[PDB]
Amino acid sequence: IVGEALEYVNIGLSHFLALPLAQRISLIIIIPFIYNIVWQLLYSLRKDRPPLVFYWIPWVGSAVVYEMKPYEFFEECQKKYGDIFSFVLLGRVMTVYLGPKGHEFVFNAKLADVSAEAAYAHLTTPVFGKGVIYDCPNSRLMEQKKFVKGALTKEAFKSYVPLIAEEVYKYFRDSKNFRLNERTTGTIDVMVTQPEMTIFTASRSLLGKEMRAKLDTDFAYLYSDLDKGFTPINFVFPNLPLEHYRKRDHAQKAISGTYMSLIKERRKNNDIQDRDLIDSLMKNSTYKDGVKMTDQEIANLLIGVLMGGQHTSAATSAWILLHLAERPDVQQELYEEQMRVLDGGKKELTYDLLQEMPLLNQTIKETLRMHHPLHSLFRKVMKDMHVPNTSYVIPAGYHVLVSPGYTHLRDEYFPNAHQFNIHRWNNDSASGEEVDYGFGAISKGVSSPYLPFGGGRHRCIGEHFAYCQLGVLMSIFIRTLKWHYPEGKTVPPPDFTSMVTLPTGPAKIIWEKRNPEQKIGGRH
């Protein structure tokens, strides 16, 4: 009889529940631990699945090494399994496709196969607000990008340049980090100065003088609070009742309120011109089906756009300064180009003249190669995906991870990739077939090993603005200052744990005026 064995199942179950809590706790730990390992071993036998990186701790997965050294994690996995491999990350299964084909697979994936907003809405909506970016369908995002792009034109860039230039000079004059009229040399932390210079220049040009004026008050603290809401932690804990989350939520309310106040006052007073992105979105934010963006949505879009560009650009100008700090030869070469293009300084910097500064633009290009601010980009897989020329199938519910920044640092595609060399872009200082997803014709192929601004439908639309901003900034730094490292100091390693891969601080440089007696004018 085995009927008596079925009885012993029941008995065993009863003797189980009657175990001392010291043991049931252990079993509370050992059972999932064993099950996890047993499951992985079975998983490896499945051949329509990419290799899965082994991990001990359930749910957590490979999260620790990934969060700390993601490029080293990728290279190790790449050696062991090749370009396609999966790993577990704090509850989710991430499928990585390395290299140009990975760029194709993910950046050019069909709209039905993957979703960006499904991956990012929880990180971004709390910070930016509702209705925009990733808190809406893709077709809405496509048109939002179209709206923002319409203020990002050549003619706008020509008007932004003297404005950005003024902000940089005002910063050299008034900021405690410089004070070039009282000081001729000094030390700065680039992770202090660049975020401040970035917000000052982006606000003045994209938002206007009103909004820029507000950064000079206590209101600036709100930006700092909202800023801290942009954190990987939001992927796991997007809302938990602490004061981080309430300073953030308050900031979002307070800042979006401020923009609507300006918007509503501009429209009430017929003061809608072609100054900034606010004027632009006001006279141009009606979707194709006739629905107009609310003033709240418009303000939330401003926040997301300004916030994203803030972190990517500030990290980038910080890296530029850090690389140049140990390369006086490059500073020297850049300075000569400045003297040549601007007639020894007797020419005012214009957007057109920026375009005649290839080495300056190659310096940005090369920094973005070595320091892609977003080391990984994700999509959630919505429908089962077959990986071409493999037997692999990526199930829905998986996430795909693309990482052009990793390919940027491979010798195969960039000879001596870990060496900073702006001349590798000689005759190629620009930041076939095209396609238009709703915000303008962009490249159809996304197979370039160099993709600092991504590609496909989620491609960046701030690239020309970023080059404009960074260009003006670096042009003025180069003409005004020399700089170098404190003894023994060199380029810091990246901090991969933050929202962008900014330098590990404190990252300090020593500056000095090329012209100690040069005075910056204006009232202060």
Ligand X SMILES: OC(Cn1cncn1)(Cn1cncn1)c1ccc(F)cc1F
| Cα separation of the two ends of the chain | 97
460 marked as binding residue: yes
Q: How far apart are CA 502 and CA 480, in angstroms?
A: 25
Q: Which does 203 bind (CB under 5 to 8 A by kind): ligand X, ligand HEM, none?
A: none
Question: Three-class SS of residue 85?
Answer: strand
Question: Token pair of 481, please?
Answer: 């200052």
Residue 205: which of 153, 252, 253 has the closest Cα? 153
Q: Give the binding site for ligand X (CB under 6 A).
A: 133, 304-305, 307-309, 312, 374, 460, 499
Nearer to ligand HEM (CB atom), residue 47 or residue 154 = 154
Tell me how far the alpha carbon of residue 3 is from its chain's centroid.
Answer: 63
Shortest reach from residue 378's CB to ligand HEM, in Å: 7
Shortest reach from residue 130's CB to ligand X, in Å: 14
Q: Which does 313 bind (CB under 5 to 8 A by kind): ligand X, ligand HEM, none?
A: ligand HEM
Shortest reach from residue 462's CB to ligand HEM, in Å: 2
Check: CB of residue 475 under 8 Å from CB of residue 349: yes
Shortest reach from residue 512's CB to ligand HEM, in Å: 27
Nearer to ligand HEM (CB atom), residue 358 or residue 462 = 462
Question: CA angle, corner 122, sides to 118 and 124, nearest 5?
Answer: 105
Instruction: Give the torsion sign (CA, 467, 473, 477, 483).
Output: negative
351 marked as binding residue: no
379 marked as binding residue: yes
Question: Token pair of 22, please?
Answer: 């010291």
Nearer to ligand X (CB atom), residue 309 or residue 471 = 309
Question: Three-class SS of residue 377?
Answer: strand
* Alpha-helical runs (H) found in 19-153: 21-43, 63-68, 70-81, 99-107, 117-128, 138-149
For 482, the enclosing helix (H) or strand (E) is: strand 481-484
Nearer to ligand X (CB atom), residue 141 or residue 478 = 141
145 marked as binding residue: yes
Nearer to ligand HEM (CB atom), residue 315 or residue 342 = 315
Name the phi and psi angles at 305, rounded to 5: -65, -50
Tell me which DSSP letter residue 207 carries: I
Shortest reach from residue 447's CB to ligand HEM, in Å: 15
Check: CB of residue 169 under 8 Å from CB of residue 476: yes
Q: Which does 461 bind (CB under 5 to 8 A by kind): ligand HEM, ligand X, none?
A: ligand HEM
Nearer to ligand HEM (CB atom), residue 263 or residue 302 = 302
Question: Token pair of 438, please?
Answer: 């709703």
List beta partners, residue 484.
510
Taking CB atoms, the residue at the shortest distance from ligand X is 308
Nearer to ligand HEM (CB atom), residue 214 or residue 408 = 408
Nearer to ligand X (CB atom), residue 50 or residue 308 = 308
What does each C-alpha distance from 156 to 278, 279, 398, 465 come to in angstroms? Answer: 13, 12, 42, 10
Shortest reach from residue 360's CB to ligand HEM, in Å: 14
Shortest reach from residue 448's CB to ligand HEM, in Å: 12
Taking CB atoms, the residue at the shortest distance from ligand HEM is 462
Integer-rounded Cα Rg, in Å, for the chain is 26
Shortest reach from residue 152's CB to ligand X, in Å: 13
Q: Give the binding site for ligand HEM (CB under 6 A).
A: 116, 141, 145, 148, 305, 308-309, 312-313, 316, 368, 373-374, 377, 452-454, 458, 460-462, 465-466
Q: Which does 499 bind (CB under 5 to 8 A by kind): ligand HEM, ligand X, none?
A: ligand X
Q: How far apart are CA 353 and CA 163, in angstroms?
A: 15
Name the phi and psi angles at 41, rounded to 5: -60, -40
Q: Which does 452 bind (CB under 5 to 8 A by kind): ligand HEM, ligand X, none?
A: ligand HEM
Residue stretches of the annotated binding site for heme: 460
Residue stretches of the annotated binding site for heme b: 120, 134, 145, 379, 458, 460
